[PDB]
From a paper:
[name] (CTPS) catalyzes the final, rate-limiting step of de novo [name] biosynthesis (Lieberman, 1956). Glutamine hydrolysis in the glutaminase domain produces ammonia which is transferred through a channel into the amido-ligase domain, where it is ligated to [name] to form [name] in an ATP-dependent process. Budding yeast have two CTPS isoforms, Ura7 and [name], which share 78 % identical residues.
This suggested to us that one function of yeast CTPS filaments is to constrain the enzyme in a low activity conformation. To test this hypothesis, we determined the structure of free [name] tetramers at pH 7.4 bound to substrates at 2.8 Å resolution. In this unassembled state, [name] adopts the canonical active conformation, very similar to hCTPS2, including opening of the ammonia channel and rearrangement at the tetramerization interface. The active state we observe in free tetramers is incompatible with filament assembly, because in this conformation filament interfaces cannot be occupied on both sides of the tetramer simultaneously. Thus, filament assembly with symmetric contacts acts as a steric constraint to trap yeast CTPS in a low activity conformation, while tethering through a single glutaminase domain supports short, flexible filaments that accommodate a fully active conformation.
Residue numbers in the entry:
A (entry chain B), B (entry chain D), C (entry chain A): 1 to 443, 456 to 571
The structure:
């Protein structure tokens, strides 16, 4: 196994995940089988009970792991499936050796951070990097390890000791370190000093970078590259310049043209990995696919506006998988996506009494939609704001997708305005009395990859026709609440057909409304299964409907 | 609450525990109520499943906590009872916040080492320092915190952050730091440089020593004290000189004469603690008691030799509580104790085929006994070696105490040589066939303070007469095995009377043999209850019998 | 003496000098006498033989010290005169103790960085902070120490040890530390982590900030201020927010409104400094003056364009004193200054063969002048480019100031085009043959405050009338070359009158050309004497002439 560690910098939120994902994607263009491990040095065992103001969205895995959105970056760039073992945390690793000490496995010795916890980190990396994550089912060739946070944090201390020990457990030809760092620009001076401090903090912890990646608001000057290669003990070929590109799909193509792949190929002896003519063929095909879709994104600049209505829409990484899933769909349609970031609370009439401007800008943005998305949501504050947008899309014919909370507000709105239940509601939203017209109810979490089966007469529906001839869709869940199973056969009478369900028939998982060109929702999160070259079908349907091109996209799928 | 942190140095095994125990004992001479917390920065939740080649004996608490022998130092010097909460470990504190994160208590935030783990350490210290540990049942005035290991270890990093934060959560008048450091002597130069490195490592972690304690093989030169007070930013009154004294009972009297108590009194504003005339009276009485017993130890130099037969007897901290319990008994009798450190395996005839010298030196030492002790033991290797010494003491009339494994080998030996069971044995020692004559059997551990009740006709026995008129003794247990309850009434026929038992009658806990001046054993560990001014009664009995003074000691107790 | 140390950050080039200068200016508004010391931790004994691509212009002192442009910031904000002792360097301080060791002054002891070099730094700060630097001639009350570079550099290591020792040599009420740090903004997140690293590097070196100053491209969020006050152990009143203001004259007024002065007043006990009613009167007058000139700068937005022709004009701190001197003049005239940054080489016809665009943009900018400045210069490359602009200003009547190299190119141009010497030249520019018509010649440097005397019949000249009735001007020099003394009486025949000279008559130091409304030059650097409330007279003349307001400004001076 070869290891690329992507690490550090003076800040988090810089590009370690995009650069790791890009590096792994580029090694996959040589036909290498690439896996990835995220290390999040935090006490949380998982991202499941975090709130998205810190580290953005939760990402759900096939096994129902709730994880850092970096695993989502790896899944979509590398085209791989990860387990909850591919995320290591301080919480996970301390819990592991503390269980192993209580079990007596350390044979009466003092259990210590070195050797025992750093051994356990190295054992975890070696175990998990051998797990097959491609659909070929073969063991990986390269593992990208991304060390989250900053090097020289108190939290990352056990992991940097584990990684400098690992660098000698595996040979030098098997381990390379990339350090990502900020080059700030101050009065048009590009400042090298934060990167010099960061490389001295690496050396202080016993690590030496094989690459520097510099993140900057402009291209590095050759003065700046040479001063980095003086005060950090590296050659100028070992500095890469990653300059705030207009889209993340272009970042691999910077790293490619700057000869990073030629450096890593030599530095890790990658020509000595056995690769078949089929592997190099798949690798070269991926390069041509990626260059095609990046050219298409760059060239095909004609707009589509999708209004995204939800909480926290000022923090755009709170919806990273939604944003990326919408981009995959829009790039497949060769249209320039704009996301209209509508704070759902601003649409509520109670905002208009506080401020005219936010209410009118948010309703004008919602009115400016070619299509509407109500994504999954983190809490109750804004449910009426989302029901208002669910209504306006139904009323005005604008293409609509309801994902998770979106399906729940779509069924609530339709019950209120089309079934004729003028007070029907959500058990999540209110429990002040034991209401009889409860549309959304509980049946501690439903997580991971589950089968949704299509209902027998569903073939009229555009959502099934976007999946094609198939009877099952396999998709990822994250919900404790769902629709009340006694109400659904009354709701189907007005045309809100539950197109797909659990194999039991007791859980409702896809709907399409008959009386509308595209008014759909899913109880699964379709974002988490989206890939750069093959979008998630509900999101491809939404953007194709919003473009007016739905029939042409449904025709391409069923061919 | 006032806090004295005792910390660090270039080595462990130096004196932090003796100096902490001495400092706390001295603050108790002002009548202050003194508690203590040990921080062991290791992954072990407790010392229960460790082996004594690292950090010496396990110490058992009243609650059945299995802990570092430093809690035993605090219990005997301060005269206090500790809970398993008075030892903090890396294993305990990570397990605590990881449970609290899984329980959702951190309200959706990222759980991190700062603030969340260092808050949890500060909360634990504040909670536990308020627990009553004196028999007065009042809240403590001063807490001695002893930080185990070395400052600038990766393991101690979260605790030094917690302690430098704690120094500002409590006011400066409430927190003082003592740093203990090695002054090596090299060609008669006293070297200050290891202490200069240690004080710069403290400053680096944001802590400043209020005291330096220097451990040295000779008294510090005034050149050495002045060079410490130059290169460490302290006054010469802030350096104490702790010079390898002939016994640890003299260490408080160094720290007292060197004005450490006058420094701490001013530095922590201790005259502003409310103290009653009864508190200052108890405090002054303790000082006079301690000066009396130290003078008695220094003056009363006439020898008694107790042979201690067990595993690991080359590592004398493997028996610290036994050693200290024997010293308390010997000082009460005003006799100079020598411990004859007999490796039990060397007494076995199979040693004589390897080496004559170890077999003959160990049997000559055992023959040189005024009395014999078989302490509790860590494993099977040497059980025959301990049965040989149990025999020779019974045969030759030499006073014998069997503690734990000692009682078990004493009953095994008596079954083999006095009941006439020529093959009877221990379920711990052998299980190669389903033996019928099993004397030692299992009934996952029995731990903590339990009542032993004396049997009704037991009053002839010298062991009961050493406890006095009382019907119960309350003592601490650490055994999974004990005596077979069907055999005991046959064993009593030859005079091996089980003087005391559990309240059930089903568990046997004290015996005395009739036909011998002192041949006794306990299923409890009597060491763990011993105090400097009042020895453990089985050990007072052993040393008094070995001195020939048993009647005079039994007369002093029953007066 | 009170001490404010201004320090550190993840970068240099951030604001330590502007914030130090602003802080000292604000303490002067309380009537305190404020001095300043710069520490430049570099091997250069002085800035005299540096080149301005690193650390901008050289600044010349009254004693002829050649120093960091920070001493120029202190001189103009605080209104004080500094000596070469007010700049400490690694070169200066090592040279000092190495001389003192060679002289035997350390009495046979090992001379070491601690104590001997850090003592010498503390002795230098104490000596130099007592030197009178105001015109009142009294000893200072507060010394601002600005530590140049980054804290945790290898170069700054001896100075941070000296400063943490100094913090205890002087009492806490006498020493306060301000740390200046970068808060970068990345996708609209304000990132606290670089400042957390910087405050842990301070604590690591044994220093604790009394203030954080955060430099950011926008106002700090209260989330950001609170997260700084969590992870750096400070109160939220101890964080100041210094947000990229449109001019440096507004920076004191941020620090004032954010209660920094109220914090420092309490933290340094400044009400306990004895101050007279005259001191507080001068202090309050300075505040009203500063608020008046900042309002005038903000309000009076009507443009004047001064074209500045020289080397390195892309690096605007290469001319900081010129830029600031031009602003003082422009603010006195209540006009909005634009500086047209003309690279003198681009005006040369040889540029037009390489690139049309730079030649035409630079000549169009020069043509766009309301007035022209040829400042002092660092070398020969561009002398013809400066002679071209000297010509075009003379030819087209545009107001011209020649400072240093400017006077030399003005005399060269006039010799070439008005005396009729078609080949006359500079000994600095060419020495390929022993030319007879040398206008600029050598008489190793002429530095510091020197008297220029006005010639007796000079009173017609506008430059004398801008100084007023006076016979002497005292001004600062930095030249090895000057005008040939045999040529001047021929050059005066065509109206290029040398209005002022050295007291010898042998050195020529001010000229004015008769046939032009303002075509002047100085052999001294008039920038170095400029003050915020009272501009340098040659620069006040230039901007007033360029504004068309010269008569009104000359009338205000002579009133
Ligand atoms: N060069 C770039 N140009 C544009 N966007 C970029 C670039 N590099 C990264 N990004 C975007 O920046 C976001 C933040 O970066 P990333 O998540 O990779 O940062 P980080 O340092 O890894 O930490 P964190 O997980 O805390 O955000 C990414 O999710 C990606 O969308
Ligand atoms: N000045 C002294 N003279 C004699 N014996 C001493 C002295 N100081 C300490 N000791 C003895 O040294 C032993 C080892 O010291 P102590 O346990 O206090 O060390 P440490 O640094 O605390 O660490 P550890 O718990 O790992 O042994 C003590 O148990 C005590 O019996
Ligand atoms: N808040 C601000 N807004 C605008 N300009 C500023 C601000 N703070 C500083 N400046 C300008 O920035 C320049 C660079 O800052 P300054 O010289 O004070 O930086 P530094 O960290 O001190 O180091 P160096 O001396 O190396 O430049 C100053 O000369 C000043 O003109
Ligand atoms: O105020 C100052 C700034 C700088 N210096 C001296 O100049 C040296 C130059 O180092 P700088 O800190 O100026 O930066 P750098 O050259 O590493 O380049 P950037 O990352 O900023 O682009 C410093 O390391 C120190 O010796 C000072 O002495 N004082
Ligand atoms: O080989 C040597 C030894 C010492 N030295 C120089 O002498 C200085 C004296 O420092 P030392 O390391 O000699 O020790 P010290 O004075 O701190 O005293 P002890 O702790 O050893 O008792 C050192 O810090 C260094 O400057 C050398 O240059 N080389
Ligand atoms: O990739 C990552 C980023 C962050 N983290 C975890 O989140 C913690 C939050 O710390 P961050 O490094 O995210 O920053 P911060 O909260 O100090 O705030 P800014 O300065 O960036 O504004 C980190 O210290 C670490 O525990 C990770 O585990 N991995
Ligand atoms: Mg990441
Ligand atoms: Mg953060
Ligand atoms: Mg100890
Ligand atoms: Mg050890
Ligand atoms: Mg400066
Ligand atoms: Mg620089």
């Amino acid at each position: 196994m070869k290891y690329v560690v992507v690490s550090g910098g003076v800040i988090s939120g810089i590009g370690k995940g995009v650069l790791a994902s890009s590096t792994g994607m580029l090694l996959k263009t040589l036909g290498l089988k690439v896996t990835s491990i995220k290390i999040d040095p935090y006490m949380n065992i998982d991202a499941g009970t975090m709130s998205p103001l810190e580290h953005g969205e939760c990402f759900v895995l096939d096994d129902g792991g709730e994880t850092d959105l970096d695993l989502g970056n790896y899944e979509r760039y590398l085209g791989i499936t990860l387990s909850r073992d591919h995320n290591i945390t301080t919480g996970k690793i301390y819990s592991h050796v503390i269980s192993r000490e209580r079990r007596g496995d350390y044979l009466g010795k003092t259990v210590q951070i070195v050797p025992h916890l750093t051994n356990a980190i190295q054992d975890w990396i070696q175990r998990v990097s051998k797990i097959p994550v491609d659909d070929t089912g073969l063991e990986p060739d390269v593992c990208i390890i991304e060390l989250g946070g900053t090097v020289g944090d108190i939290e990352s201390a056990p992991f940097v000791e584990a990684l400098r020990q690992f660098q000698f457990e595996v040979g030098r030809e098997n381990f390379a370190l990339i350090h990502v760092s900020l080059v700030p620009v101050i009065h048009g001076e590009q400042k090298t000093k934060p990167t010099q401090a960061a490389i001295k903090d690496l050396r202080s912890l016993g690590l030496i970078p094989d690459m520097i990646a510099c993140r900057c608001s402009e291209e590095l000057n050759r003065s700046t590259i040479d001063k980095i290669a003086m005060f950090c003990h590296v050659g100028p070929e070992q500095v890469v310049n990653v300059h705030d590109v207009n889209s993340t799909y272009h970042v691999p193509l910077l790293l490619l043209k700057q000869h990073m792949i030629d450096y890593l190929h030599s530095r890790l002896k990658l020509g000595e990995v056995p690769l078949t003519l089929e592997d190099k063929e798949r690798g070269s095909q991926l390069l041509t696919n990626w260059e095609n879709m990046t050219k298409n994104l760059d060239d095909s600049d004609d707009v589509v506006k999708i209004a995204l209505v939800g909480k926290y829409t000022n923090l755009k990484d709170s919806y990273l998988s939604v944003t990326k899933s919408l981009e995959h769909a829009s790039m497949k349609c060769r249209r320039q996506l704009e996301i209209l970031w509508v704070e759902a609370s601003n649409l509520e009439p109670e905002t208009q009494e506080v401020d005219k401007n936010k209410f009118h800008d948010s309703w004008n943005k919602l009115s400016s939609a070619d299509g509407i998305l109500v994504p999954g949501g983190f809490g109750t504050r804004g449910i009426e704001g989302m029901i208002l947008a669910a209504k306006w899309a139904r009323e005005s014919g604008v293409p609509f997708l309801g994902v998770c909370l979106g399906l729940q507000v779509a069924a609530i709105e339709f019950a209120r305005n089309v079934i004729g239940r003028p007070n029907s509601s959500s058990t999540e939203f209110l429990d002040e009395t034991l209401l009889a017209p409860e549309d959304q109810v509980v049946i501690t979490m439903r997580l991971g990859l589950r089968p949704t089966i299509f209902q027998p007469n569903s073939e009229w529906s555009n959502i099934r026709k976007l999946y094609g001839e198939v009877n099952e869709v396999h998709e990822r869940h994250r919900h404790r609440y769902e629709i009340n199973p006694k109400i659904v056969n009354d709701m189907e009478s007005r045309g809100f057909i539950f197109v797909g369900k659990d194999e039991t028939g007791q859980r409702c998982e896809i709907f399409e409304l008959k009386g509308h060109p595209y008014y759909v929702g899913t109880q699964y999160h379709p974002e988490y299964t989206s890939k750069v070259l093959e979008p998630s079908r509900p999101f491809w349907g939404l953007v194709a409907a919003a473009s007016g091109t739905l029939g042409e996209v449904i025709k391409d799928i069923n061919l």
